[PDB]
Amino acid sequence: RYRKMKERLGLTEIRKQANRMSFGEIEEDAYQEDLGFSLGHLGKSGSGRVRQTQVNEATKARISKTLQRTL
Amino acid sequence: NDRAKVILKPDKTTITEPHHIWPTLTDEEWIKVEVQLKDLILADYGKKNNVNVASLTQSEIRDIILGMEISAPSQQRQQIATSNYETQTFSSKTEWRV
Amino acid sequence: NEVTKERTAQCFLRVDDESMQRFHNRVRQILMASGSTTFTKIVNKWNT
Amino acid sequence: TLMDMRLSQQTVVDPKGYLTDLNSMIPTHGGDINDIKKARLLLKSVRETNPHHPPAWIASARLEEVTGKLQVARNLIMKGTEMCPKSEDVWLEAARLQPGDTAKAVVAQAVRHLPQSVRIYIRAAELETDIRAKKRVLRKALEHVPNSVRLWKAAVELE
Amino acid sequence: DGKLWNLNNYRTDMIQALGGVEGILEHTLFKGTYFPTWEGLFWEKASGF
Amino acid sequence: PTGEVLSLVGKLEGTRMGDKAQ
Amino acid sequence: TGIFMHGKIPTLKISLIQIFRAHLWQKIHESIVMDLCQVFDQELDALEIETVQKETIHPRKSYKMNSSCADILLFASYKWNVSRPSLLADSKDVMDSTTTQKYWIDIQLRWGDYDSHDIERYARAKFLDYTTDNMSIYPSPTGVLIAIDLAYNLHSAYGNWFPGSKPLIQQAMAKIMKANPALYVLRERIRKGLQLYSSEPTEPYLSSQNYGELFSNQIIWFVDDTNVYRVTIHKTFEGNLTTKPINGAIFIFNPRTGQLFLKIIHTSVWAGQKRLGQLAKWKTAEEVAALIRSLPVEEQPKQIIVTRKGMLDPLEVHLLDFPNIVIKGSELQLPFQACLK
Amino acid sequence: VFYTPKELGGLGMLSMGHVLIPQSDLRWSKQTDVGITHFRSGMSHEEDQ
Amino acid sequence: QKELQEKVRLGLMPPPEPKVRISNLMRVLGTEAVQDPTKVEAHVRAQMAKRQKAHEEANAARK
Amino acid sequence: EEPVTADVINPMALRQREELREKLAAAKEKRLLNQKLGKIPWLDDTAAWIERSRQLQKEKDLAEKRDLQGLTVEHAIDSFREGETMILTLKDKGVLQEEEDVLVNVNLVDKERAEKNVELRKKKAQQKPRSILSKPHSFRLEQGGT
RNA sequence: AAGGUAAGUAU
């Protein structure tokens, strides 16, 4: 149970790259409605990853148990 | 690769069939071979590092087997941890010998 | 004029008072709801 | 792509046969590259170490094509053809990235380095928008590979 | 509708007007970090803890 | 030198808004 | 610390207290004092220095910005021709000012601001204010004062220069600034506080703590290219030691099924290549990708572990069609190169 | 500290106004083998940035 | 369960050992299975058999 | 004093200049290639080509009727023994790195690490410790061998 | 005029 909770709540590699911003390399604004939003090293040169980071499926969003009962 | 080859066959009756690589052994025979090889692997760490094998805790024997080793040339970083801040003195060559 | 292709009129633009008041109120609610908030978030809201 | 294949089927040694695939066209995989600059440098290194590796040139130029720099990709493919002339995959990729008229020239040059390749010949049929032009190229193709039914079947459409 | 504005020129001229990286970073503790250059550097927006 | 953002009502009115844009 | 707060900026105060914890200012001063002692202890019979002593000073001497004393005391063998006081950067020296038997060396640490990070003017002003002072205590009328700006990592010196001292002081200060344990601690603490890094990202990485989690049911491939290019070297008593190339082997071990895929490479491949080190990496990566394409999707790996850091980027390039495969470096050296033995 | 882009540690503020940078803020200095050398940015005899 | 817990509290019974299966072997006995892997495997399989031994013994005695 | 006005370091301007240089270099190579790529009756007569092909069909029947090592090794001469032989493998280096392809032996490297560690444990020009470390016996191969 | 007091043990 603790391992599953830590996997669900622990930092993911893509979410690890999200909070890393390259120093000195100004990036064009991505999201119009929110200028604060930025991908960080995600999809930008300098991240050190040649291949694209994959989605951690342990962080998938799914309905609660009681919401399954209603369905 | 010299004593280990001797350990890998524990008895003169143990042979390697041409089908595979390692010799065919009984389960407890493999236990004994593994403990002998663990002693062999600890032997060079005891020799080349001049440390007693008994001084190795069960946590660091695992690191020795796997192949992780640590070194620390910069012990002066001990700085990270009547006052003893100027009390340290300097010994010159003259003091060393004059 | 699309037919004569000539200068016929002249349009003067101006920001409506309601739009200015809306922007001022938006900046006010950015500022007043910024007690325990990072400087970066406040500047991001102002920039947006 | 990979030009090496290994089919998998009381002996410790199992030498499995080495096979070569005639052509390999992996999907473009748009956006799979995270560091475009690092990937570009590494692909440059591949081109330098193995200039006679057609997959190296194919991946290096297609990386410029996914990036949007569609002009450097043409130069990379042209250099690859200059260094990998016997690979029909590089010539087929050249006929795709290059603009129309020059693409025709590319095919007109591929025949110089590889005349038996029926695949480029039929490719020229797509490249030439004139039926009379198709008559010249396809009938010229049969002067080098007349045993190909897949190419001779276009004679009826060629009239 | 697309992105109907661009701030590339604005940010470029903002860095140029502040004196570039050298002029901007004299105001900061960057020279106290003793990084040889600003090229291979990245921030971490949120700490590990 | 104060750093205060001064209003440009009548200031920098000579230039158009198309300047320094591409 | 010697940091002067211009107003109560509580966040800055907390940050500077954390950065200079465990008495870092005193430790930096002591380390620089020791470094000057050693650099002057080596060249004592060439600079005509009879002896060098570390003056017994207060533990809070590093903190005194109003006054100062001497940290290093040089006693001359015969005498020293004191030159006119000048900055460390002054190339021209008028070595005809006075004479002396004792030389004092003072090291002052400061935390400069943007408007006042000029270390040369600071050193000149401090030397003039301390030499011509009845509060500062010095053991001789001549000496030099070295000023360090930690906030900007600048260094300078002002005062008298006996012959052979200025170049030695310059080189020693350059070496100390470039490398020093207490200075390195300061840089690391400032980096951690500012939280910017010199390109050391954290990625999946086979340590000894996640070794247990390796043993799952998923397919794992240990790829080794250590024995790709290899030669045998043998020394002969009658002649000279000689080398002979031998065929290489790529290891594609699979710990689950035990399948050891051995790619045997002839020595003819390294015929006319100038750069064999990366040719081996690219050949091995090509073989790994080809083997992945050979196996079916059910037996295809989804976690490739590499025993050499050099074969991380080549695999990422050659696995560009398989994004669902994680390539993990191993910081612990597995003994997969000994299977050829 | 306001108009420096967020990548360099600044707040990345966008200015719809008239802000002058004092020339005293456009000066920096660097240390090399020959000693310390000081740099400005506004070579042209113009107003403050 | 409370009977067992209070027996263990007062030292009547030895404290329960972790239940280790093959998939569990690298989590409970991970550090000792690198030094003597086969001894650890034998111990784990002996524990598994003893757990199976008690179940079959109870089934046979009840039958 | 008078400060020297240095070149303003604008990372965005540098990026734009690099992109423009790449764009202008790409155009030059395109024109250079077009200087070469652009320098390469029966095409309408089906009967003529058919006759030529029939001639070709009988035409085919009528025709039927080691010195390469000058690299370096990161070891000492005294390290090896005359009575033994050992394998030398390439040292790990990044592909993007341009360093020379030095050569090592894993057992000798392990021994060197062990002796370095024991020396460091026993431990516990100007300014030797702050210079050599912050800022590996080896010998290359002369023709056939050193 | 301020919004600029480190706190803690010991006599």
Closest CA to H4 of E18, A28, J14, A19: E18
Structure tokens at G258: 């035990």
- Positive or negative, the Cα torsion across G139, G141, G142, G147? positive
CB < 8 Å to H39, chain J: 3-6
Rounded Cα distance, E34 and G190, in Å: 10
What is the pairing mode between strands G221-224 and G205-206? unpaired
DSSP D128: -
Closest CA to G180 of G11, G30, G13, G298: G30
Rounded Cα distance, G293 and J107, in Å: 35
What is the pairing mode between strands G326-330 and H28-32? unpaired
Radius of gyration of chain D (CA): 18
Closest CA to E29 of G153, G237, B50, G331: G153
- Positive or negative, the Cα torsion across A34, A38, A44, A46? positive
* Residue G133: φ, ψ to 5°: -145, 145
Q: Which residues contact J143 (CB under 8 A, 6 or more apart)?
A: J67, J70
Structure tokens at D12: 């410790």
Rounded Cα distance, B25 and D42, in Å: 48
- Cβ atoms of F16 and E9 closer than 8 Å: no
- Cβ atoms of G4 and G41 closer than 8 Å: no
Interfacial A residues in 22-41 facing J (CB < 8 Å): 24-26
Rounded Cα distance, G110 and G96, in Å: 32
DSSP D52: T
Strand partners, G248: G265
Residue D149 burial (CB < 10 Å; 0-12/13-18/19+)? exposed
G1 lies in which domain range?
A: 1-197
- Positive or negative, the Cα torsion across G33, G38, G42, G45? positive
CB < 8 Å to C44, chain H: 12
Degrees (nearest 5) of the Cα angle G69, G73, G77? 155
- Positive or negative, the Cα torsion across E11, E12, E13, E17? positive
The structure was resolved to a resolution in Å of 3.1
Closest CA to B13 of B2, B31, B3, B26: B26
- Positive or negative, the Cα torsion across D110, D111, D112, D113? positive
CB < 8 Å to G323, chain A: 51-52, 54
Find the DSSP H helices in G5-64: 10-19, 24-42
- Positive or negative, the Cα torsion across D41, D44, D50, D53? positive
Rounded Cα distance, F12 and G283, in Å: 63
Picking from D78, D135, D142, the nearest residue to J33 by CB comes out as D78
Distance CA G162 to C1' K2 in A:
54
Task: Please tell me which residue of chain G has the smallest CA distance to J128.
Answer: G39
DSSP G44: S
Q: Provide the experimental method for this PDB entry.
A: cryo-EM
- Cβ atoms of G101 and G142 closer than 8 Å: no
Closest CA to G226 of G265, G173, G268: G265
DSSP G75: E
Distance CA G194 to C1' K5 in A:
28
* Residue D19: φ, ψ to 5°: -115, 150
* Residue C5: φ, ψ to 5°: 55, 45
Beta strands in D92-148 (DSSP E): none
What is the least distance, in Å, from the CA of J95 to any CA of chain D?
Answer: 7
Q: Cα J74 to the chain's mean position, in Å?
A: 20
Nucleotide closest to G10 measured between CA and C1': K4
Rounded Cα distance, J3 and D54, in Å: 55
Would you call I30 an interface residue with chain G, using a CB distance cutoff of 8 Å?
Answer: yes
Rounded Cα distance, C38 and I51, in Å: 58
- Cβ atoms of D44 and D79 closer than 8 Å: no
Structure tokens at E5: 């504005």
SS3 I2: helix
What is the least distance, in Å, from the CA of F9 to any CA of chain H?
Answer: 9
SS3 J143: coil
DSSP codes joined into one string, E1-48:
-------HHHHHHHHHHTTHHHHHHTTSTHHHHT-S-STT-EEESS--
Residue B49 burial (CB < 10 Å; 0-12/13-18/19+)? middle
For residue D104, give the H/E element and its range: helix D100-113
Structure tokens at G283: 């050949």
Residue J11 burial (CB < 10 Å; 0-12/13-18/19+)? buried
Structure tokens at B42: 């600890």
Picking from A24, A27, A38, the nearest residue to H8 by CB comes out as A24
What is the pairing mode between strands G143-149 and G242-246? unpaired
Picking from D8, D29, D39, the nearest residue to G294 by CB comes out as D8
Would you call D25 an interface residue with chain G, using a CB distance cutoff of 8 Å?
Answer: no
CB < 8 Å to D10, chain B: 19
Residue A61 burial (CB < 10 Å; 0-12/13-18/19+)? exposed
Measured CA to CA in angstroms, residue G9 lies from F1, G16, G45, G177 at distances of 22, 11, 51, 29
Rounded Cα distance, A56 and A8, in Å: 9
Question: Cβ H28–E21 below 8 Å, yes or no?
Answer: no
Rounded Cα distance, B30 and B24, in Å: 9
Interfacial D residues in 12-41 facing B (CB < 8 Å): 12
Question: Cβ B31–I36 below 8 Å, yes or no?
Answer: yes
DSSP G45: T
Rounded Cα distance, A59 and A7, in Å: 8
Residue D64 burial (CB < 10 Å; 0-12/13-18/19+)? buried
Q: At G21, which CATH number?
A: 3.90.1570.40
Measured CA to CA in angstroms, residue G131 lies from C39, G148, H49, J134 at distances of 47, 18, 42, 36
Distance CA B81 to C1' K9 in A:
22
Rounded Cα distance, G110 and G32, in Å: 13
Rounded Cα distance, G108 and G168, in Å: 18
Residue with tokens 């070579």: H43
CB < 8 Å to A43, chain D: 31, 34
- Cβ atoms of G229 and G283 closer than 8 Å: no
Closest CA to J76 of G228, B2, G235: G235
Instruction: Output the 3-class SS for J81-136.
Output: CCCCEEEEEECCCCCCCCCCCCEECHHHHHHHHHHHHHHHHHHCCCCCCCCCCCCC
- Cβ atoms of H11 and C40 closer than 8 Å: yes
For residue I62, give the H/E element and its range: helix I37-62
Rounded Cα distance, A52 and D38, in Å: 12
SS3 G164: coil
Rounded Cα distance, E4 and A27, in Å: 17
